[PDB]
Nucleic acid binder design. Structure first.
Ligand code: XG4
Ligand code: MG
Ligand code: MG
Length: 425
DNA sequence: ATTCTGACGCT
């Protein structure tokens, strides 16, 4: 009753760019705009692996993790843009720099947690208060929410339903109560519209947004109405929302843990978790997960918006599947050098931009036939931004995996250098 | 033979 907290204290938004790499390519090459198009890596093996698909191409069934040669079978007019290759590997620089454009705009409005290359979380709690005070009891007009969906509304053409649902919501709002959580989400949603307009005016990129009370619901909400739309998931929309929402759709339940929840408990949808006591959930899934499941299926999550705009690591990786696996000493050195040279270029730029230095170098490898994704992971000290030292140090730290009696055995199916443990500079 | 990352938990 009066003492059960409900997790309505914060306003949090999740903003995610629509088909991000495709839009980066469509801004640069106007011929790709408004066409079925995808972004690939490499081109020789089945036309390249697709990692970004425009919404026009998706109408034909083109998805991520698909080979371009297969996508062409579904979509014969599909236009492909290729990630830049450097030193024999894919080079994601253009998208990381495009991401920085976006993150810097978002950060003018509020503190953001960079959650991926194309998405950040936003804590709007303070911005909403400041804004609620400025409005001075003034009602909120649908004109301020031109692209907002209210989840679960209307109740009782797509743009027609959106406006109906928005009118119903706005009509019910108690505008004189500066502490009502629904009012705060609505105001949060006004700011997100502003944030999304500034991103498009200043980058040309379009995006979607989720507006709710915590990071997990904002993320879920963000996908309900992509593309170029934002969605407000209110505390009261949760029971209906979760009653048919598959467990796997919730961030962090998409894998094994969500599968064990499904299998142990004999359930399918998020809302079914509410029938289990916290202790029961803790008993099956641990004290942390259990507490987090007991609260999450009621729409409650306390994970904070971390004030972190920059990555914590900087990493370079290349897979070597199949017969291309590295089998010689010279080969493993040349690719450590290729990896280290990109890492160095990235690091020197990070130091100059962000006033910091990485202090630890992590080397990860895979050998052929090793079931695991990493056959080994070892760290050494990262004392100089010198590619030749880093690659040499990576070799020193993995050379005892070779079993050869100049040859390399087992052949390596993955090299991976990561710079970590940043310190101010 | 999607590949290339990046966060964060567990022990
Ligand atoms: N190298 C690599 N890049 C990837 C991979 N997956 C995605 N990317 C790249 C390409 C993606 O643009 C971006 C991740 O953004 P998302 O939210 O996952 N997808 P998007 O923005 O395309 O579509 P929408 O958000 O509208 O659903 O990173 C991958 O496995 N590998
Ligand atoms: Mg995206
Ligand atoms: Mg994303």
């Amino acid at each position: 009753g009066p003492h059960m907290a409900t997790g309505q204290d914060r306003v949090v938004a999740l903003v995610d760019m629509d088909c991000f790499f495709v839009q980066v390519e469509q801004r640069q090459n106007p011929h790709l705009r408004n066409k079925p198009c995808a972004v690939v890596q490499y081109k020789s093996w089945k036309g390249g692996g697709i990692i970004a698909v425009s919404y026009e191409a998706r109408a034909f069934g083109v998805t991520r993790s698909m080979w371009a040669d297969d996508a062409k079978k579904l979509c014969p007019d599909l236009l492909l843009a290729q990630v830049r290759e450097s030193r024999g590997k894919a080079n994601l620089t253009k998208y990381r720099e495009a991401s920085v454009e976006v993150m810097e705009i978002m950060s003018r409005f509020a503190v953001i947690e960079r959650a991926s290359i194309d998405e950040a979380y936003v804590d709007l709690t303070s911005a909403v208060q400041e804004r609620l005070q400025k409005l001075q009891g003034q009602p909120i007009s649908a004109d301020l929410l031109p692209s907002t969906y209210i989840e679960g509304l209307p109740q009782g053409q797509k743009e027609g339903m959106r406006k109906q649902g928005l009118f119903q919501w706005l009509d019910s709002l108690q505008i004189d109560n500066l502490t009502s959580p629904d009012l705060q989400l609505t105001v949060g949603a006004v700011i997100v519209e502003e944030m999304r307009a500034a991103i498009e005016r200043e980058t040309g990129f379009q995006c979607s947004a989720g507006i709710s009370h915590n990071k997990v619901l904002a993320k879920l909400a963000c996908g309900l109405n992509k593309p170029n739309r934002q969605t407000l998931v209110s505390h009261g929309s949760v029971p209906q929302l979760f009653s048919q929402m598959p467990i796997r759709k919730i961030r962090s339940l998409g894998g094994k843990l969500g599968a064990s929840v499904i299998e142990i408990l004999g359930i399918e949808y998020m809302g079914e978790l509410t029938q289990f006591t916290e202790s029961q959930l803790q008993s099956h899934f641990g004290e942390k997960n259990g507490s987090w499941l007991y609260a999450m299926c009621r729409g409650i999550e306390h994970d904070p918006v971390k004030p972190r705009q920059l990555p914590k690591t900087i990493g370079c990786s290349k897979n070597f599947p199949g017969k291309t696996a590295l089998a010689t000493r010279e080969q493993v050195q040349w690719w450590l050098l290729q990896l280290a040279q990109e890492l160095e270029e990235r690091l020197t730029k990070d130091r100059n931009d962000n006033d910091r230095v990485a202090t630890q170098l992590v080397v990860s490898i895979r050998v052929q036939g090793d079931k695991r994704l990493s056959s080994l992971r070892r760290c050494c000290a990262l004392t100089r931004y010198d590619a030749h030292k880093m690659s040499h140090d990576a070799f020193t730290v993995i050379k005892n995996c070779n079993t050869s009696g100049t040859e390399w055995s087992p052949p390596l199916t993955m090299l991976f250098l990561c710079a970590t443990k940043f310190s101010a500079s």
